[PDB]
Structure formats: structure tokens, C-alpha cells
Design a protein around this ligand. Structure first.
Ligand SMILES: Nc1nc2c(ncn2[C@@H]2O[C@@H]3COP(=O)(O)O[C@H]4[C@@H](O)[C@H](n5cnc6c(=O)[nH]c(N)nc65)O[C@@H]4COP(=O)(O)O[C@H]3[C@H]2O)c(=O)[nH]1
Ligand SMILES: Nc1nc2c(ncn2[C@@H]2O[C@@H]3COP(=O)(O)O[C@H]4[C@@H](O)[C@H](n5cnc6c(=O)[nH]c(N)nc65)O[C@@H]4COP(=O)(O)O[C@H]3[C@H]2O)c(=O)[nH]1
Ligand SMILES: OC[C@H]1CC[C@H](O)CC1
Ligand SMILES: OC[C@H]1CC[C@H](O)CC1
Ligand SMILES: [Ca+2]
Ligand SMILES: [Ca+2]
Ligand SMILES: [Ca+2]
Ligand SMILES: [Ca+2]
Lengths: 256, 256
């Protein structure tokens, strides 16, 4: 078959609450312990099964529907974690992918605070994951939103570090708290006379005062060893677990 | 807008010859003259319009249908250029994206030769664009195909340079003739204290093989200037032209 995703299809799916948060664990690189997670959206379409984000997020962004989607994902994430919030490790980080439209929408900050207040400000840390692809623009208006969120104890990550066109300029405007190295670099062989120099360079550029580095996309122990050896702070990847449904995240990570 | 497609849908589209070669011009960095092109597939679906490769190539590759697709694209490319082959610049390069399945299929080399023989061996140069993503495996069998194609005056490019896990190893197994710097790096701002150091590093690593370098994805004169100044040999990008249909490529680039 040939299914076509249009704004009308996404909008109906939102009405039916078919966009679910799946969750991928994040770990301390030095101790191996659970420190957090990233929420990754999945469209659980009753007739066709699970549709991944690459087959709808870009249209959700250009149509504006992402705003409603992310609002639902944040409510649902809170609903999943509320019953086990007392079992989470202290300072448990929750990563939410935030596109430019979401960030700039009126009431965004109130939705962030609502998630934090449900789970416990003393307990979790909300991490808003931003990207240089189709980015938040550098305006005083955008920086004011960013600063207000920071003042309310919300933090930020930069996704896909090493792939952006003007990353220093971006970080100047949006001084985030975490740098997530793009998976492409995380998976490069240290011994390779080309690729080992690339990942070396990217990781060195990522070392900035106060910024914690997350190596995302770790698939093998040898990738993990390279990142650990470079003093990266957090690890995320298929080696540990792909993203899983809420209940499975609770059963396999919060409880283990 | 997002098309969720099955092997059965691709196969029917191949039966209907709906996969068309679009063509993007490539230029000499020093003189600005037309030197070649890259063929980029477009699914011209009669009911829904033009579907880009990101919404079907990966399934074409995993299903095996890419083999038939590329065979069609090569025949069609020859059919487009045959009527104007005498008007092409001498040594006109034709870049064809070749996935692992295509490369390894019996009769691949004969399909390459058929294209070359139609357009003229002393006239064009067929360039097979390979990628480290889902790559040809490093086996004696694979290297024998690669060598035989080289002995028949066919050449190779490495796509997406700067993104592969073990690029030196890859080039040692598959000693290509051109390096294409990935667009992500070509578009980095030289003045950026992060991104300028990344593109600097990637371009210096791209010299290491001592091959011709193509900068793809050039969108601004400043990107072009950075690449020209670094001694890159060829330029390709929206600054000059996006990929266009065959007739338009002939009318706008081949002809004057
Ligand atoms: N091969 C491999 N892949 C790994 C590994 N570890 C993690 N990943 C995948 O890498 C992606 C990480 O998220 P991302 O870079 O922000 O990249 C994300 C993000 O840009 C976007 N996205 C996902 N969820 C959301 C969302 O709720 N909102 C928005 N605006 N974008 C989202 O979709 C992209 C793709 O998401 P997913 O398909 O869920 O793909 C996810 C994740 O499952 C690994 O070890 N190996
Ligand atoms: N933003 C921007 N983009 C530019 C610019 N100049 C060129 N591009 C785009 O960058 C891509 C370059 O091809 P690629 O990296 O091999 O990346 C290709 C290639 O991996 C694959 N693909 C395309 N045609 C074929 C094919 O016939 N066979 C196979 N196996 N893969 C193909 O799909 C990918 C995407 O192709 P396209 O969507 O046609 O996208 C093309 C091209 O239109 C620029 O200045 N700005
Ligand atoms: O657990 C550490 C956290 C690092 C920031 C990332 O964005 C989410 C997880
Ligand atoms: O025109 C020069 C050619 C360089 C190799 C590329 O793969 C296509 C164009
Ligand atoms: Ca992310
Ligand atoms: Ca990533
Ligand atoms: Ca290519
Ligand atoms: Ca590329």
C-alpha cells in the first residue's frame, strides 16, 4: 500500500491521541547508573502499526501541528512517570525534543512548568532538546523565552552537535546546559586515520565550561569505551536500550 | 506530503517507469565551467506529484528493488543524453548513486558499459558514487568487481565524506577517484569558532587521499569561496542549480 501523511491525517491522529511518548534511558558514563531519559514520539496507528518520527515530524513542524503534538507528549510523559516519580533517581533528567514552533508558542513555558510540578521540582530536571536544523531564530524575543525558562530551573540540550552551520553563534544566543554529540561521530573508529580525527575534533570542540556532554547513538562497547575515555558525562544508545513504551521503560529501567 | 510506501508500491511504480532521473550540474571550481552532473532519482507519481528519494530509497535498498530502479535510471539517463552527447564538454562526468545491492548484482558492470558505449567512451566519464552508509562489504569478491570496473575506465566517488565510521579503512578497500565533502560541512560558516574548525578539519582530511574533491551543497558564494580557496576541484549546489528534469538540464546547462 501507499499511505500519504498530510496535515489532515496528523490532525485526526492527534484527535485520537495516537502519538505516544516512547522513552530511551540515559546513563552516567563513569558509573553506568540510570540518570535520565529522552522522550521520542511514535505514531501508533491502529491499522498500520508504529510509524517513526522521520515519516511525520517534518510535516508536523511545517504545518504547525507539532505544537499540539508536543503538548500531548508532555502531558502523557507526566502521566507515565507520575505513578513512579518517587522511585526515580535524584535529579532524573527528562529530555523533550522541542522544535522552534513549540518554543515560540504562547504558553509553552506553562506547559513545561506543569510537567515539572507533577513530577517534582526537587526530583527531576526537565531538559529541552533543541536543534540547529530549522532553528529557533536569534532574536531578543527568542532569548527572552530561553532566559525565562532557565530562571524557572528548566535546562536545555543541543542535539546533533557537529552538524550545525554556525554552532558557536548558536550557543552564544542559546547557552544550553548539555551538548549531545551527533550519532555519526559517536560511532567513528578511534584508530581510523580519517574518522578517528573527526570524532577527536568534534569531542574537543564540545568541551565548554559547565556543559555536560552526552554521547548519543552508542551501539557497541568499543564506542562506549572511546566516549568514556574522552570524559563524556552521559551515554545513550541501542547498546543499552532503544526507546521503549512507557510501561516497558518503567519495568526495565526505573525498576532495575 | 510524507509518503509511507511498501515494496509492492515501488514495484508497481517501476512497472510504470515512474522513477525519473533528475540531473544536477557540477562545475570546475577554478574556471566555473560545466564539467559534469549527478543523477538524482525522483518518483513522479501521477496522482500525488513528485516524491523525493528520502521517502523511498531506504526501502528500495532494503527490499532489493533498488537494483531494478538503478538499471532503469541508467538506461533513462543514456536516453536523455544520447541526443546531445556531441554537445557535452569533453570528459563530461556522469555521477550515478550506486548502493551496495546494485554494485554486487550480476550484470551490473554490463549495464555501466552500456551507458558508456551509448554516450561515447572517449567523450564521457561514468562516476559511480558510493557511500559508507549501508556499504559494500570489504571482501575479495567486492574488490574484484571494483577493480574490473576501474579496468573498464569507469570511476568512483565517495559520497558524504566526513560522516563515515571508518573512512580510511573504506578508501583502502575501495580506492575511489573523487571525494565528495558532505553538504553539512560545505555549508559551515568559516568564521564560526566551532563550525569553521569542523569544516577546516574535514577538508584537510579529504586531501589526505590525494584525489579530486567535490564540494556538494554549495548555497552561497561565501561557501563557494571557502571551498575554492581550499583547492577543492569541483562545485555542486543550489547556488548554481538544484537538480532539474532532463529536458531542462539540456536546455539550461548543456546548451550554452
Ligand atoms: N541507529 C541508532 N539510532 C539511535 C541509537 N540511540 C538512539 N537512536 C535514535 O536516534 C534518535 C535520537 O534522537 P534525535 O537525534 O533527537 O533525532 C530525532 C528527533 O530529531 C526527531 N524527534 C523524535 N521525537 C521527537 C519529538 O517528540 N519532537 C520533535 N520535534 N522531534 C522528534 O526524530 C529524530 C529521530 O527519532 P527516532 O527515530 O526516535 O531516533 C532517535 C533514537 O531512537 C543508536 O544507538 N543507534
Ligand atoms: N539543501 C541542499 N541540498 C542540495 C544542494 N545541492 C544538492 N543537494 C541535495 O543533496 C543531495 C545530494 O545527494 P546525496 O548526498 O548522494 O544524497 C542522496 C542519495 O543518498 C539518495 N539518492 C538520490 N538519488 C538516488 C539514486 O538514484 N540511487 C540511490 N541509491 N540513492 C539516491 O538520496 C539522497 C538525497 O537526494 P536528494 O533528495 O535528491 O538530495 C540531493 C541533492 O538534491 C544544496 O545546495 N542544498
Ligand atoms: O540523563 C542525562 C540527560 C542528559 C541530557 C539529555 O538531553 C537527556 C538526558
Ligand atoms: O564533474 C565532476 C564530477 C565529479 C564526481 C562527481 O561524482 C560527479 C561530477
Ligand atoms: Ca534529541
Ligand atoms: Ca542525534
Ligand atoms: Ca551522491
Ligand atoms: Ca551527501
Amino acid at each position: 500500500y501507499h499511505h500519504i501523511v498530510t496535515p489532515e491525517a496528523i490532525s485526526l491522529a492527534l484527535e485520537n491521541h495516537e502519538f505516544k511518548p516512547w522513552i530511551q534511558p540515559v546513563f552516567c558514563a563513569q558509573t553506568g547508573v540510570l540518570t535520565g531519559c529522552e522522550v521520542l514520539v511514535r505514531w501508533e496507528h491502529p491499522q498500520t502499526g508504529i510509524i517513526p518520527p522521520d515519516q511525520f515530524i517534518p510535516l508536523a513542524e511545517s504545518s504547525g501541528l507539532i505544537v499540539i503534538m508536543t503538548r500531548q507528549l508532555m502531558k502523557q510523559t507526566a502521566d507515565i512517570l507520575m505513578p513512579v516519580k518517587h522511585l526515580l533517581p535524584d535529579n532524573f533528567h527528562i529530555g523533550i525534543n522541542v522544535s522552534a514552533g513549540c518554543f515560540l508558542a504562547a504558553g509553552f513555558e506553562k506547559e513545561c512548568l506543569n510537567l515539572v510540578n507533577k513530577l517534582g521540582n526537587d526530583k527531576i530536571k526537565l531538559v529541552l532538546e533543541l536543534t540547529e536544523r530549522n532553528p529557533i531564530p536569534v532574536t531578543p524575543e527568542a532569548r527572552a523565552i530561553f532566559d525565562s525558562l532557565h530562571q524557572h530551573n528548566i535546562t536545555f540540550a543541543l542535539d546533533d552537535f557537529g552538524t550545525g552551520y554556525a554552532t558557536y553563534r548558536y550557543l552564544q544566543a542559546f547557552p544550553v546546559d548539555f551538548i549531545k554529540i551527533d550519532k555519526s561521530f559517536v560511532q567513528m573508529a578511534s584508530v581510523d586515520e580519517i574518522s578517528g580525527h573527526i570524532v577527536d575534533n568534534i569531542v574537543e570542540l564540545a568541551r565548554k565550561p559547565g556543559l555536560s556532554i552526552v554521547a548519543e547513538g552508542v551501539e557497541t562497547q568499543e564506542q562506549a569505551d572511546l566516549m568514556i575515555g574522552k570524559g563524556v558525562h552521559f551515554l545513550q544508545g541501542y547498546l543499552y536500550s532503544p526507546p521503549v513504551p512507557g510501561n516497558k521503560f518503567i519495568s526495565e529501567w526505573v525498576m532495575k
